[PDB]
Design a protein around this ligand. Sequence first.
Ligand code: F6C
Ligand code: CLA
Ligand code: CLA
Ligand code: CLA
Ligand code: CLA
Ligand code: CLA
Ligand SMILES: CC1=C(/C=C/C(C)=C/C=C/C(C)=C/C=C/C=C(C)/C=C/C=C(C)/C=C/C2=C(C)CCCC2(C)C)C(C)(C)CCC1
Ligand SMILES: CC1=C(/C=C/C(C)=C/C=C/C(C)=C\C=C\C=C(C)\C=C\C=C(C)\C=C\C2=C(C)CCCC2(C)C)C(C)(C)CCC1
Ligand SMILES: CC1=C(C/C=C(\C)CCC[C@H](C)CCC[C@H](C)CCCC(C)C)C(=O)c2ccccc2C1=O
Lengths: 137, 80, 65, 753, 139, 46
Amino acid sequence: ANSTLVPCSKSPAFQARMKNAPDTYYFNKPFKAYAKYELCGTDGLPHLPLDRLDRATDVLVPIGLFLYVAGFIGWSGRSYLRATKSASDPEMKEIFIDLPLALQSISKAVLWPLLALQEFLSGDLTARDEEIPISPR
Amino acid sequence: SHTVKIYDTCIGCTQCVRACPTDVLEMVPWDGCKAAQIASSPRTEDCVGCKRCETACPTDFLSIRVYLGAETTRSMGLAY
Amino acid sequence: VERGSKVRILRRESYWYQDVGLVASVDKSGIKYPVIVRFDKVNYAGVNTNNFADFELLEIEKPKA
Amino acid sequence: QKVRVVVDNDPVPTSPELWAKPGHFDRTLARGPKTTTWIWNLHANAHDFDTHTSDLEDISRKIFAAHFGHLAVIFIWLSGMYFHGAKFSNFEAWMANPTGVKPSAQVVWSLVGQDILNADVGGGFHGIQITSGLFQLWRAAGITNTFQLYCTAIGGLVMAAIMLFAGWFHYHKRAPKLEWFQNWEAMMNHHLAGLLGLGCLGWAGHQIHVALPVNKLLDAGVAIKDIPLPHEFILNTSLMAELYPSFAKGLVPFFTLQWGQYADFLTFKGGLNPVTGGLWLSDTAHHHLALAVLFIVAGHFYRTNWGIGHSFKEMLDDAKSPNMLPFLNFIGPVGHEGLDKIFETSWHANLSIHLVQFGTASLLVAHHMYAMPPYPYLATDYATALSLFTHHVWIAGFCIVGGAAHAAIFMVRDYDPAHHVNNILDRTLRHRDVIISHLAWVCQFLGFHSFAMYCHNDTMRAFGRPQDMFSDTGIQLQPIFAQWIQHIHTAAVGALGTTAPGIGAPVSYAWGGGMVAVGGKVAMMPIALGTADFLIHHIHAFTIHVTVLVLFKGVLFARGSRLVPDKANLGFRFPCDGPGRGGTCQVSAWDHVFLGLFWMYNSLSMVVFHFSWKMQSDVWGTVDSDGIVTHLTGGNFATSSITNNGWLRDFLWAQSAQVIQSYNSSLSAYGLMFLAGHFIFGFSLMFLFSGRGYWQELIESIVWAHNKLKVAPAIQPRALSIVHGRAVGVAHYLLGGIVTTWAFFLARMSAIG
Amino acid sequence: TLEGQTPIFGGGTGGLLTKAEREEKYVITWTSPKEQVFEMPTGGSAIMRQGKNKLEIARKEYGIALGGQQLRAKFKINDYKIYRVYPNGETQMIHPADGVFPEKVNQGRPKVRYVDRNIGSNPSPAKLKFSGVQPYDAP
Amino acid sequence: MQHVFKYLTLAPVMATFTMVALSVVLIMLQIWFPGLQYGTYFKPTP
Ligand code: F6C
Ligand code: CLA
Ligand code: CLA
Ligand code: CLA
Ligand code: CLA
Ligand code: CLA
Ligand SMILES: CC1=C(/C=C/C(C)=C/C=C/C(C)=C/C=C/C=C(C)/C=C/C=C(C)/C=C/C2=C(C)CCCC2(C)C)C(C)(C)CCC1
Ligand SMILES: CC1=C(/C=C/C(C)=C/C=C/C(C)=C\C=C\C=C(C)\C=C\C=C(C)\C=C\C2=C(C)CCCC2(C)C)C(C)(C)CCC1
Ligand SMILES: CC1=C(C/C=C(\C)CCC[C@H](C)CCC[C@H](C)CCCC(C)C)C(=O)c2ccccc2C1=O
């Protein structure tokens, strides 16, 4: 077990940092949260270790949240781009946002992981190598 | 001097000859294209290498190619 | 190929290599590159049309009707 | 009859249809985007009106409407400044205690700890210390409360709305003909007598009736609440009589040419007010009245409609051999004949001249404002003085570069060889080789005999041979001519004998005659010049001459050169003419402007560094009860500035302690901006050092990656064009460097100022 | 010798240099319907006379630019010729080569430096190592 | 007015609106819940 990291509430340097702080909105409750939940090094500052079986939700929750949001944005963009390909003037739809199409793309991308899995299973996710422009070797 | 080559993809659009600032190219009779003419570079000694002909060429890829070679007084564009 | 057909370019140095174009006209004379193909996307020179021979094209869709 | 008003009625309908048609002004851009280069082209050609259409009249109408729009923008900015000074400032507390309160007019919200930037500026106020000098300006104008600032802000908003409506009206409703814009004589008369003259007269009236009495009461020490409102100074003539006895005699002395009785409020003192350190407001009132009279007189010089006056065309046509001076007849038998067509047809030449003169005006503003501080408590507000000088120097440099650029644009586009046959422009173009060769030689001479001498000083100091250095204690280089000018200007007022007896105090204390202190700090004192000043002034001469070399080579060779004879056909802005002729990279005049931007940045950075170091070392400081002055850097400039190791250590390294140690304090934003400017400079380095082919091939690979996932865009991604890459590089370079210097200066002078 | 009167020009610094007298020089001759102002290739404005005009220039590009972009495009003059003059007095008429402008196809002109293939079929340089032939010159 | 609506759908206008909305959301999150850190999100205030 890692011994150089101890809970912040038991770190003398972190306690000194807490006492020496300004008394504003930005410091009181954040320090209470850091003392209760964070692990502090010898410098008295919170450190984020990835070596604990416990507090694994503290790692997976932000990672999963960001992955969901990024996949949502990417799937919305991809679905909108694929929907604009069938149009006669797709560039005009890329400089002029087609609101119903964008709303439909966002609504569908709300469930982006399942749609991506289905597209990968059916081969719709990727185009074959021989239908993609390439440079001479 | 530079080397100017013309490949069989030329469509005889005469744009490269018009673009040349030193009269290196000219149009000669041909039968490989609808225009019945092809570009030629009989005066490559006067070529400066500006590659204006390549810019003017509409084919893909280029039907006229300029390969920079040994530098002379006139290929460096020197008035002195 | 003929007018209205969809083709895939097989010319290696072409900007539209392995891309899709539409045949606009075929020249019946004995010129080297009789087929004229137009493309939706322009190349680096801003040109969206080119001349190809038959062996440099792969038909992927017959002309409508 | 010749000068008359002619307009077209409803030439352009007011419809938002073209708002949904981006690039409508350009034939190429009207078809829509095919690659990402279309967006950059749309933004780059937005205001290039002469490429939208070939009709000069429509171009001029566009110029007029756009100028109204820019005036509206300026009015909005001024209204914002006044409103922030009225609502989120400590202006009243500062007016109560000018010498003990830091001006502040920006307050930040408290969300992410940025409220630490609310510095304790005195007067019970927490905010960002401003360095714009707005408080001193408002105090000099007689403003004493925030209500007047609020009223001025409302008036500024109203003026902005009026300017916007004027632009709309004069473009879409009543558009003047081309003949209207070509009235040189009427325009000059109206802008000399009506704009400068009447504005000077109005400001002199405001000063005499409002600013002088209020500021006299303020300097007398009476409180703000006991000072009556400005209108009371007009209604109650008894207050005028008490403050200035001559006002008891009304307007009689003015109309009888007995103006000498007005000397109590129209003074000619010179020097500075001992109480505040700024110029006497009565001195400035007389100055502005004299300017008003002179400008109104100048506004009757040109012939408009009554035969009286001078003609531009006749005067230009007469200026040629043999009508010139005997040694000035080399301009040839044509001379200035033919130049009138340039002003008939070319907006770009006028823009070039006016940008050059705006640069001149801003340089004069910076110099004459630090040397003769015109506002109360401005000289002793060191941060404000440094900020004003640096800001106006930079504005002047940018204006000069723009003047050169638009001169090159005129040469490429509007120049007509038929109009200039053996005239002065033609002869200049025909000996451009002489001009450029001599300029290059003098640039080399200046570079050697300034910077190589600095390197010589470095090497001699490293050897431990100070006696061999160019210094006051070694091989001296005394600027004897500048010292002589200082002595003459000091002796002129009585402080080549007494050539200006009417001025009591020295015109500027920087030339000599004494020292002025206000709040225990030096306002102005004589600025001695030695070997270091000689060296730095010749450094300035070298940098300016090289910038001139770059810009003037660009302008003179814009049409073409021995390398590319047909550059005019290629245009003002093109990347190259191919790798041939050995390589013709950056031959266009635009690239010469691009390089001149860098050289102007170098020159002006040295100018502002010289100003900052010399002011901190030999002028600014604190004065004790005994009159002994201790300066901010303790006289480093004489011995440390003669080597660039001295510049590196005692100026860059030593004076950056404030910005570098500003974390966890109210100046931490300055340290953040210091790092940000360094980052932006480093970032610009890649746009400057690389080429677009590499980026295009990398984008090819990335586009393959996007195509594999069916997410490629129809608007095909393209690397920036060569010219676009150069522009991005120079813009980010200048931004990073200027922001770095700005943060450095402002942090240091907010901490120790 | 070449006949024609030089255009009215007061002098300039973009004229001939040592290369003109040491290595080679060029002369552009033409005929105009009237006296009119044109632009010199190296800066400045000159006046071409009504008769036949002759102008000395340092590079062939100067003459090509003057003949094409100014004489034909602007003044509608099509009879201009460009000669190359050597220091020993030998003169060759080099433009147009055969009396017909190069942009117009003319019978009898041979194909020079023509490659009987598309540009993508050039052999790789590894084929021609130590053989001294470039891929574009390969048969 | 339809031209104004079409103008409002331009890529720069929509991008500015989206960035402004996201910035407002993030700013309000900072104001309401300052000092959020990894290992602290969605945890009760002590
Ligand atoms: C990558 C990198 C990085 C990272 C990673 O991760 C980060 C993170 C962090 C964290 C941890 C925190 C919190 C969290 C939250 O919020 O949480 C809630 C939410 C949720 C839960 C969720 C949310 C979600 C969302 C809403 C979604 C959406 C998003 C979008 C898309 C974005 C985009 C948009 C735009 C921007 C507009 C923070 C914060 C801070 N910041 Mg920091 N970041 C960074 C960056 C940056 C930069 C550049 C700068 C400069 C500007 C800064 C600044 C700052 C300040 C001032 C401050 C404060 O105050 C805070 C605090 O307190 O601390 C502690 N920093 N951060
Ligand atoms: C005395 C008459 C007069 C005055 C004061 C002006 C003033 C101005 N002209 Mg102008 N002009 C005049 C006559 C006059 N013109 C005539 C007769 C012609 C035709 C030959 C022109 C043709 C002309 C052109 C073609 C252009 C100008 C432009 C400008 C502006 C230059 C920018 C500047 O310095 O900002 C000064 C900043 C200010 C805030 C000044 C105040 C602005 C308002 C409009 C002044 C109103 C004064 C009025 C008497 C009301 C006063 C009320 C009370 C105080 C007494 C400036 C506002 C340029 C411009 O920007 O156009 C918009 C421009 O491109 N003028
Ligand atoms: C009275 C002032 C004035 C006026 C009216 C003009 C007018 C004009 N200039 Mg000009 N210019 C000026 C001053 C002026 N200039 C100055 C002072 C300089 C020196 C820097 C230049 C340098 C210059 C060049 C080099 C060129 C022009 C060009 C042009 C023409 C096209 C305008 C254009 O491209 O839109 C401007 C469009 C843009 C996209 C520019 C905006 C981008 C800027 C650089 C951002 C600046 C950063 C910002 C201030 C700070 C950071 C922001 C933050 C978000 C980080 C037009 C006739 C161009 C032309 O073709 O002329 C015929 C051209 O090539 N000018
Ligand atoms: C539709 C949105 C979208 C999607 C799904 C992707 C997807 C991808 N991009 Mg990509 N990209 C995009 C937009 C997008 N890009 C834009 C707009 C740019 C220009 C800034 C780039 C520039 C770019 C580069 C330079 C690289 C990728 C790479 C990649 C691949 C892995 C890394 C990654 O996710 O990008 C990370 C994301 C970025 C680098 C920037 C994208 C962020 C933009 C601003 C979001 C735009 C959202 C859009 C406006 C939504 C509108 C939809 C609405 C109308 C409904 C992946 C295939 C990499 C690759 O080839 O991997 C193999 C790579 O090197 N992209
Ligand atoms: C020679 C011109 C001149 C000078 C020296 C001054 C000097 C002064 N003015 Mg003033 N002013 C002027 C003209 C001038 N003014 C004009 C024309 C107007 C409008 C009609 C005003 C309106 C005005 C207001 C509203 C205020 C001042 C104030 C002040 C004082 C503050 C310092 C300052 O403005 O910078 C000094 C400026 C300079 C040293 C140079 C700028 C002057 C012009 C731009 C020079 C132009 C010459 C040009 C480069 C060459 C043209 C080309 C050539 C062919 C002719 C100071 C005493 C303020 C005050 O009350 O003081 C306490 C104030 O609030 N002025
Ligand atoms: C510190 C870096 C540096 C230096 C030393 C130079 C030096 C020079 N630049 Mg330059 N330049 C630079 C950065 C630099 N540049 C950058 C970053 C840019 C991008 C904007 C440019 C852009 C630029 C342009 C656009 C132009 C110049 C020009 C010049 C020359 C000006 C004439 C001169 O001063 O001659 C004197 C030479 C020096 C002062 C160089 C230092 C000499 C040392 C101190 C003494 C050497 C002693 C001895 C000879 C050594 C011999 C020993 C042996 C073993 C070698 C000169 C060669 C101009 C030019 O060509 O002028 C005609 C010009 O047009 N430069
Ligand atoms: C530099 C600059 C600036 C500004 C400045 C200023 C502040 C200026 C001013 C100006 C001015 C300040 C002007 C003025 C003008 C005026 C005028 C124009 C007037 C006129 C008047 C009149 C016309 C009158 C009339 C009358 C009446 C009403 C009644 C009775 C009769 C008589 C006639 C007397 C800024 C910073 C913003 C920005 C940058 C640049
Ligand atoms: C445990 C963990 C970790 C680690 C991890 C790892 C190591 C991972 C790996 C991973 C991997 C190894 C991966 C791979 C992948 C592959 C691929 C191949 C992919 C692909 C993708 C795609 C295809 C996508 C698509 C999409 C989507 C879905 C959405 C949006 C749009 C798009 C289109 C983009 C860490 C420490 C960090 C943190 C904590 C936890
Ligand atoms: C880096 C570089 C490029 C690549 C740069 C390109 C293609 C421009 C990319 C611009 C982007 C797309 C603008 C947007 C960037 C913003 C940071 C995105 C903000 C996103 C928000 C969600 C925050 C060139 O094309 C180039 C060309 C010629 C000389 C030098 C260079 C050069 O140095």
